[PDB]
CSV table of C-alpha atoms and ligand atoms in Angstrom, one decimal:
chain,number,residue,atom,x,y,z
G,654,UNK,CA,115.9,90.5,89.8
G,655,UNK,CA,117.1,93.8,89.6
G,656,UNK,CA,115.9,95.2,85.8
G,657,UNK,CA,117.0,99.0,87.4
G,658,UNK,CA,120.2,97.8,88.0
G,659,UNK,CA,120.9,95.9,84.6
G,660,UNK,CA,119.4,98.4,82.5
G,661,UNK,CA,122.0,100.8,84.5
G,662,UNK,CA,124.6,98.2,84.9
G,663,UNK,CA,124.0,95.5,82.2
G,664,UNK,CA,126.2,94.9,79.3
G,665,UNK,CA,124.8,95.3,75.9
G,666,UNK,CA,126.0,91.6,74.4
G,667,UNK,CA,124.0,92.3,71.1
G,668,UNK,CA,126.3,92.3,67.6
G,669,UNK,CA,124.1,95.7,67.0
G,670,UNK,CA,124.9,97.5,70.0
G,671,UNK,CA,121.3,98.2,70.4
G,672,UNK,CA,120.8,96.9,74.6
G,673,UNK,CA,118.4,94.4,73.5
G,674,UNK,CA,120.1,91.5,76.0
G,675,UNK,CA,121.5,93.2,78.7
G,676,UNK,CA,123.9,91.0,80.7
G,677,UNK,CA,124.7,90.8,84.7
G,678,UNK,CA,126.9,88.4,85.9
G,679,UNK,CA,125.4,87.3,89.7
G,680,UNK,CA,127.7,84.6,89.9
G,681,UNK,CA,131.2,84.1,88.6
G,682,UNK,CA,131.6,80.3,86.6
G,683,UNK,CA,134.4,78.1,87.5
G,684,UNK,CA,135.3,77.2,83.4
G,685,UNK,CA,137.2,79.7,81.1
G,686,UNK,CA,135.4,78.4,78.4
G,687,UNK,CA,132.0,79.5,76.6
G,688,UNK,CA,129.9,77.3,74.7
G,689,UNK,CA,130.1,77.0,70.6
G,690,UNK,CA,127.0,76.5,68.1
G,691,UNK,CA,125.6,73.0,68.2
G,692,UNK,CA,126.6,72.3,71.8
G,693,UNK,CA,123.9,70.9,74.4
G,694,UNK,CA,123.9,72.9,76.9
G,695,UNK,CA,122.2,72.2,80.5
G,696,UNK,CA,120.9,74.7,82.5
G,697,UNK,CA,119.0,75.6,85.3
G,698,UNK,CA,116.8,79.1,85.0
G,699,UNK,CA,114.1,81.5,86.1
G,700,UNK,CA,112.1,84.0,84.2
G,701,UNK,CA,109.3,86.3,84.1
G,702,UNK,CA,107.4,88.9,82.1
G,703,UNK,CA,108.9,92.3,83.0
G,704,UNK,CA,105.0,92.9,84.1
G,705,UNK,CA,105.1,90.6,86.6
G,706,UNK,CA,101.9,88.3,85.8
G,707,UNK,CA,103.8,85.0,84.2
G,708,UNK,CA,106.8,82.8,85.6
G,709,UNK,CA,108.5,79.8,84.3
G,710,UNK,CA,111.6,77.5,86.5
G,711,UNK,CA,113.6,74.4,85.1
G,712,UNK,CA,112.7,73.7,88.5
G,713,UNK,CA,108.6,73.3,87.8
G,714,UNK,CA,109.4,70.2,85.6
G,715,UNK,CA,112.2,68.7,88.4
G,716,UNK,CA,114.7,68.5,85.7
G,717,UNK,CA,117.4,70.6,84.4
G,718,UNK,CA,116.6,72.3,80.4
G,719,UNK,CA,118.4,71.2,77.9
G,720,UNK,CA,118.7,72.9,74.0
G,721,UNK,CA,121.6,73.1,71.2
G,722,UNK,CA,123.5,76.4,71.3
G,723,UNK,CA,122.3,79.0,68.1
G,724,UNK,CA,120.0,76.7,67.0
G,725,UNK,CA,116.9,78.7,67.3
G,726,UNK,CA,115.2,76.3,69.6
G,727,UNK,CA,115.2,78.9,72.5
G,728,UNK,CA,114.6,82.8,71.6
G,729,UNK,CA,117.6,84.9,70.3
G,730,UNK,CA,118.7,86.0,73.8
G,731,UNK,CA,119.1,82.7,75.0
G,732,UNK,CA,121.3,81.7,71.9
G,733,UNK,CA,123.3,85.4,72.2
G,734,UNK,CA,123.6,85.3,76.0
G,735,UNK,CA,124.2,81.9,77.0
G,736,UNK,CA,127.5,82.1,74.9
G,737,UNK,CA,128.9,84.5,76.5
G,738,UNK,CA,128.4,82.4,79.6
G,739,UNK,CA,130.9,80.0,81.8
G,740,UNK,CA,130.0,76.6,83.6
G,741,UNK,CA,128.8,77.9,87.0
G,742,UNK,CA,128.4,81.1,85.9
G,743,UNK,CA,124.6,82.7,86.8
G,744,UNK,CA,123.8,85.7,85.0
G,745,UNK,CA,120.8,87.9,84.7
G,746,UNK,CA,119.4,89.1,81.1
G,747,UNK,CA,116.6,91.6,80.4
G,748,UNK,CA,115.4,91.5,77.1
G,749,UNK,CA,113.3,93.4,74.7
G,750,UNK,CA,111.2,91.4,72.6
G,751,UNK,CA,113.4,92.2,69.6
G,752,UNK,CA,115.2,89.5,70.7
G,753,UNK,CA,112.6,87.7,72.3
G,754,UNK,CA,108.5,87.0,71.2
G,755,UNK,CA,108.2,90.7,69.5
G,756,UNK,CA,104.8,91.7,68.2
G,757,UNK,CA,103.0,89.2,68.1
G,758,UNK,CA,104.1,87.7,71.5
G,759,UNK,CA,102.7,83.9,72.0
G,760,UNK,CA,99.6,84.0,74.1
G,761,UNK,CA,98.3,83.2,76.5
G,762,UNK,CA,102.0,83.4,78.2
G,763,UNK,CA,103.3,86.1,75.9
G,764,UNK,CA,101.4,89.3,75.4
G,765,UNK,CA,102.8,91.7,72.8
G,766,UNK,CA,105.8,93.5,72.7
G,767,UNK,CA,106.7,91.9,75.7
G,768,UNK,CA,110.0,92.3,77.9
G,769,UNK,CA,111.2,89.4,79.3
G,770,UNK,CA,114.0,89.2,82.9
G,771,UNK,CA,115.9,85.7,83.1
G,772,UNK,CA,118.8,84.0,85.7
G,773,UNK,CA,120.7,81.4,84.3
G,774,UNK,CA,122.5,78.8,86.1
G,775,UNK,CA,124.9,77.5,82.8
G,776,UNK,CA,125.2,73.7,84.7
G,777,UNK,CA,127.1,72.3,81.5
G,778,UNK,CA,127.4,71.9,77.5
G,779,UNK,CA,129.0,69.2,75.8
G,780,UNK,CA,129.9,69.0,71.6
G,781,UNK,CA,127.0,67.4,68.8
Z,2028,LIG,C1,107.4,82.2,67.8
Z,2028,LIG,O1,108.7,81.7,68.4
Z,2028,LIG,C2,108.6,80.9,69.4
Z,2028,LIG,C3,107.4,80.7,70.1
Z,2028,LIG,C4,107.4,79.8,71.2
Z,2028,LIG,C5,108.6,79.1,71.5
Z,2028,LIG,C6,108.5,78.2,72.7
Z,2028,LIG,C7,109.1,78.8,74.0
Z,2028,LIG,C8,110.6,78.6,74.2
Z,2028,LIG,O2,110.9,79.4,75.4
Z,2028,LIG,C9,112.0,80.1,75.3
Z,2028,LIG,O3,112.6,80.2,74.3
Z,2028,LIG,C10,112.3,80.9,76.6
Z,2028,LIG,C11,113.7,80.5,77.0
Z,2028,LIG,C12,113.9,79.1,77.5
Z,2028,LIG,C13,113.0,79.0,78.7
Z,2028,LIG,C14,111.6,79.3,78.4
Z,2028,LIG,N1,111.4,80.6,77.7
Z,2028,LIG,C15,110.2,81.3,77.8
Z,2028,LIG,O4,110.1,82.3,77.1
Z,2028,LIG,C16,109.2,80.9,78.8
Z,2028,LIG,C17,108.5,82.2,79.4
Z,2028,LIG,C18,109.4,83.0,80.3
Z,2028,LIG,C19,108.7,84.3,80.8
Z,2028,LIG,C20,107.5,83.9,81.6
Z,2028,LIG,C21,106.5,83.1,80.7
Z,2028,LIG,C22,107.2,81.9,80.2
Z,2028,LIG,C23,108.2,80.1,78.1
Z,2028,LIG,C24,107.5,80.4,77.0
Z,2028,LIG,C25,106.6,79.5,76.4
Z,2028,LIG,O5,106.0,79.8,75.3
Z,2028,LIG,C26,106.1,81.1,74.7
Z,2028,LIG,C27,106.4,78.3,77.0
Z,2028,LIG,O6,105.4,77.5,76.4
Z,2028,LIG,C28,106.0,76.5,75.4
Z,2028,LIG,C29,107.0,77.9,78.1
Z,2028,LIG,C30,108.0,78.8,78.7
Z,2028,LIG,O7,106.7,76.7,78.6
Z,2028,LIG,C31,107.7,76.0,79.4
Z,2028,LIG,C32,108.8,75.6,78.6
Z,2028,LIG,C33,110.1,75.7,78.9
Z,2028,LIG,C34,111.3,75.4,78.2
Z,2028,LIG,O8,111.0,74.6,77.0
Z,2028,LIG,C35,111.2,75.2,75.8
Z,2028,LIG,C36,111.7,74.5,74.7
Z,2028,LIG,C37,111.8,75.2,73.5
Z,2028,LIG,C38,111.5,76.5,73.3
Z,2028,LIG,C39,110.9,77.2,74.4
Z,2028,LIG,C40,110.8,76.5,75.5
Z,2028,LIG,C41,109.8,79.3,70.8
Z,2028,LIG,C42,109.8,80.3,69.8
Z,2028,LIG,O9,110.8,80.7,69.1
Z,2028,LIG,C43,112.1,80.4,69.5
C-alpha cells in the first residue's frame, strides 16, 4: 500500500472530519449502490500494522469474510468505510486507532495505539 500517498491523497470519510479513515479508491466498482446497516456484506481484504510486523488476508482462511454492516462486529473503520464502498470497488483505508483497537490495542496482534492500512475487495452485500 501506499500510506504516503493516502495520508496526501486519501479522503477523510469520518462524520468528524478528523482523517481517522482515510479512503483511496484502487479500483472503481461496477454497482451505483452502497451498502445499508444490517446488510451482509462479503468481502475479500488485506491488512497490516502500519509497523509492518503483523498481516491478516480473507485469503489465509480460503474463504471470502463475511459481517453485518454497522453492527460493531468489525472495528469502526470497517463499518464507516465499507459504506461508502461499491460492488467491485477496492479501496485502501489507513486508520488511526481511534477508529480502530486504540489504547489498549489487542495483543498479541494489536499493540497500542496502533495504526492499521487495509484493501478491500467489497465482493457483495445482500439485506437481513
Ligand atoms: C476490543 O474490540 C475488538 C477486539 C477484537 C476484535 C476481533 C478482530 C476483528 O477484526 C477486525 O475488526 C479487523 C477488520 C476485519 C478484518 C480483521 N481485522 C483486523 O484488525 C485483523 C488485524 C489486521 C492488521 C494485522 C493484524 C490483524 C485481526 C485482528 C484480530 O484481533 C484483534 C484477529 O484476531 C481475532 C484477527 C484479525 O484474526 C483473524 C480474523 C479475521 C476476521 O474475523 C473477524 C471477525 C470479527 C471481528 C474481527 C475479525 C473486534 C473488536 O471490536 C470490534
Amino acid at each position: 500500500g501506499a500510506p504516503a500517498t493516502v495520508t496526501e491523497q486519501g479522503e477523510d470519510i469520518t462524520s468528524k472530519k478528523d482523517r481517522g479513515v482515510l479512503k483511496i479508491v484502487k479500483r472503481v466498482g461496477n454497482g451505483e449502490e452502497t451498502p445499508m446497516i444490517g446488510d451482509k456484506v462479503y468481502v475479500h481484504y488485506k491488512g497490516k500494522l502500519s509497523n509492518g510486523k503483523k498481516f491478516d488476508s480473507s485469503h489465509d482462511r480460503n474463504e471470502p469474510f463475511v459481517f453485518s454492516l454497522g453492527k460493531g462486529q468489525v472495528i469502526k473503520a470497517w463499518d464507516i468505510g465499507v459504506a461508502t464502498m461499491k460492488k467491485g470497488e477496492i479501496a485502501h483505508l489507513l486508520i488511526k486507532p481511534e477508529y480502530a483497537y486504540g489504547s489498549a490495542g489487542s495483543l498479541p496482534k494489536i499493540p497500542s495505539n496502533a495504526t492499521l492500512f487495509f484493501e478491500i475487495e467489497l465482493l457483495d452485500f445482500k439485506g437481513e
